[PDB]
Write a protein that binds this ligand. Sequence first.
Ligand SMILES: O=C(O)c1ccc[n+]([C@@H]2O[C@H](COP(=O)([O-])O)[C@@H](O)[C@H]2O)c1
Ligand SMILES: O=C(O)c1ccc[n+]([C@@H]2O[C@H](COP(=O)([O-])O)[C@@H](O)[C@H]2O)c1
Ligand SMILES: [Cl-]
Ligand SMILES: [Cl-]
Lengths: 468, 468
Amino acid sequence: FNILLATDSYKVTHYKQYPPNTSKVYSYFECREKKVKYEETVFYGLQYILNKYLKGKVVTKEKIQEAKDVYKEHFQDDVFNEKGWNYILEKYDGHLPIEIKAVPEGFVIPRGNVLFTVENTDPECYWLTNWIETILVQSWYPITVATNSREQKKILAKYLLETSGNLDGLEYKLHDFGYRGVSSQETAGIGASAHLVNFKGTDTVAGLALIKKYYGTKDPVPGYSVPAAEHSTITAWGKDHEKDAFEHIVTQFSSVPVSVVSDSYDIYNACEKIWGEDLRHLIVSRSTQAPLIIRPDSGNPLDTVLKVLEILGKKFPVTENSKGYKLLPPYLRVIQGDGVDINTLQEIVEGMKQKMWSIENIAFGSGGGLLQKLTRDLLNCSFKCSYVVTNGLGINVFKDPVADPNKRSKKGRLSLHRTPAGNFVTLEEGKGDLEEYGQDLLHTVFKNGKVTKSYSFDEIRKNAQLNI
Amino acid sequence: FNILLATDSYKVTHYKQYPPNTSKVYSYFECREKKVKYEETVFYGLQYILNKYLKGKVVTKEKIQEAKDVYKEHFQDDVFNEKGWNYILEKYDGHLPIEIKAVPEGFVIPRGNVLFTVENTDPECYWLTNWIETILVQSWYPITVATNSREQKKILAKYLLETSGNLDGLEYKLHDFGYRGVSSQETAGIGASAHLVNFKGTDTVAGLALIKKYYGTKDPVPGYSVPAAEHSTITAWGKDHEKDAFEHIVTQFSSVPVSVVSDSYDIYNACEKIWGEDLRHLIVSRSTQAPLIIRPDSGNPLDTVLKVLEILGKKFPVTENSKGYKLLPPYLRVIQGDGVDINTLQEIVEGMKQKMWSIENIAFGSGGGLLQKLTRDLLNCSFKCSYVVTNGLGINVFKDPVADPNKRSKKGRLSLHRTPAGNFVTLEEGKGDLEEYGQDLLHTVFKNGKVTKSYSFDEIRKNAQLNI
Ligand SMILES: O=C(O)c1ccc[n+]([C@@H]2O[C@H](COP(=O)([O-])O)[C@@H](O)[C@H]2O)c1
Ligand SMILES: O=C(O)c1ccc[n+]([C@@H]2O[C@H](COP(=O)([O-])O)[C@@H](O)[C@H]2O)c1
Ligand SMILES: [Cl-]
Ligand SMILES: [Cl-]
């Protein structure tokens, strides 16, 4: 990895564009307001970026020469700031003279607030603040995964509490199926780690090693899975032998939970005749700690869940819980793992509630909806210069495009505070210095090539908890 | 990287679910037909995956032990196939006994056709075929980027040819702005490389080194950029000094093209009064090889482009080209880099055509729309087992879910052929062996830990050309 080649091309040319006599460039990141509405965001992911990409000796003579050679051909011109990068090499042994202050990871902050700020610590490196905008703005992705996952946890929490009276099992109710559906191995790990801020069930193994290496947990692992079938392990038996596949798999996994995809040919037949009759004797014998989890994987998601439950409720003994909602026997559950995103999740649990089914009966799996079907504009994650020093005077700078007030940016030196009512406010124009609003909640997390404050994954999970 | 830890968790448990005495599992990848329709796909990106993740000694003693320890805790049980992985280590020095056949990279193939196949070459490793599904299915991402980019090139080619009579400059008409808007550094490189299959303009630097390392070009680099401003380099001068910023930047870059974002405060004032009056003498003096490129970045994309052009056409000498379309002087161009995706791209060029503006006048930048706002379900990229051998007998296998005939999969051993009319057909059930359709177009690209056939980036670009 070469940080000199990890920026937007045009940023290579910006050192010639700032005002002369500029000694400081100060920039901030927010999830900009736009006036499920995503009113508050989980701040998560910067610590990964700091350690993987920004800390330590990130400049070498070889990296300078490599960048110089690439850019000469890429621009067909000599515009690369070799002098400025060699300065950092010789002066700071290749450590970035940058200070980053950030809200603690896991903090849940309303839209439109400063979440981190970046500035250069040496006047010669005024150009460096926005060089690393591109790498830092990629924090949008773990922020947005963690936020969208938590918003799904809010939906699940509400309907589970309403239909059952408690939140038992909530942390396993949204399973990460997204490994194949994301754009890269690296995205898999980052996105899966952001989901585990809120939940404990994952098949995206990549997230485990990321958390261990960059954040840490008291527990051996941050997330868990169960054995489960795929269409290959069912269909390989032949169409006429689906029952034999089911019987073999539940017997191989007789003492742990086992998920069995049941829609290879006819999900409703599988539920009513194969599970509900031919193999019923292998299901009602199972432990409460080792249920069969029937997995549909096609059709209209709500219609299929509802029909599957109706089928199973006629072949297995249903109870009515203390809230009036129907409950399958404890050895039998369902996981809907197709078509799940935050919108269909809500439709399904509302539809179950209207048909008097407890959310205890169901868990969800989500892949592309959870980790890939997300963009930087969902929360308007954005990085802008708000303050410069030129000729020794600080000036508050901003954009304010005539045709879109939503893209107006903040002015001056910024700080994040609690309000008297316990909410959040970002103070602009250095007004945090007046000390009317208590302590700035941004802390220095990076300075001159060293990570200066770190959070464990356990702390992040605590910070990101739901009120309830 | 540890490929033992680079699969969906549940696949760790599948070796215990296949039929006993299974010696062969054979699977295939397609962009499934679903009933911009995306009727044909660019096959690109498998060679990256083969070289970075699958080739060579990918199993070691340490990797087996690492995976054993992680899965013990992740499943809270001993289901990991330590013996099977030890077999590969001991028998093949950690090389995967897998054979992959694939259509040549860059090939443009209609939906619903086999693009690559995977099978084990040792009967003990029947479970390995679908272990590596997860990593191989991530090829959906370079396929989809390349396809969606090529579809945008088709739109630009149509309207450029109608409004100018040629395709001059086509390969620079859609510039990759997506580095900050993707989910990771790895995704940035893969996605930018996929865009460079069709175009030459990019600010996602990460794409260059990926191509150099994994594909290769005769030219020094596969893509190019120009100097350009951002809001920080304009607003740092102060709101009242926007003119001074503009003058400085165009004078710093007097003899190469320079793009200057012009909407910090009022795009229309910047065009009409700052560029169109105050600084006009610095624009009309510029060379045809070094235009000013004015960049709006906010507002309704079509409305803003049309109003910017109308303004500029009243302040600068417009000609009428041989097709009857209006054309700015050669020292002045526009780039629309906000809100561009395949849908708005079409809207803008059609709206320009209706107002008699040549597409010569404009280029587009696209970031999230080009590299991030894409999912595996756009082309229904999918990997399924179609053939197994069990007790020495091959059987053709498939899924066929009752509620969604679109998820029906192909049966048996597959091959890809030219039809008598020169189209493509996928033959199922081993019928390619009949030789009624000539030779299979798939080539073995990986066998027993080695890449056996490969393509330069130059060949890929040739294969992906538009008909025109
Ligand atoms: O069942 C599992 O343990 C499992 C783990 C990973 C993926 N899957 C399946 O993979 C598919 C991913 O699709 P998607 O659209 O959510 O990206 C979906 O059918 C899931 O049920 C299933
Ligand atoms: O002008 C450039 O060279 C340039 C290079 C990289 C990114 N950008 C800008 O960054 C923004 C990317 O936003 P998006 O939503 O397309 O991902 C958009 O306003 C672009 O104009 C601009
Ligand atoms: Cl599956
Ligand atoms: Cl910009």
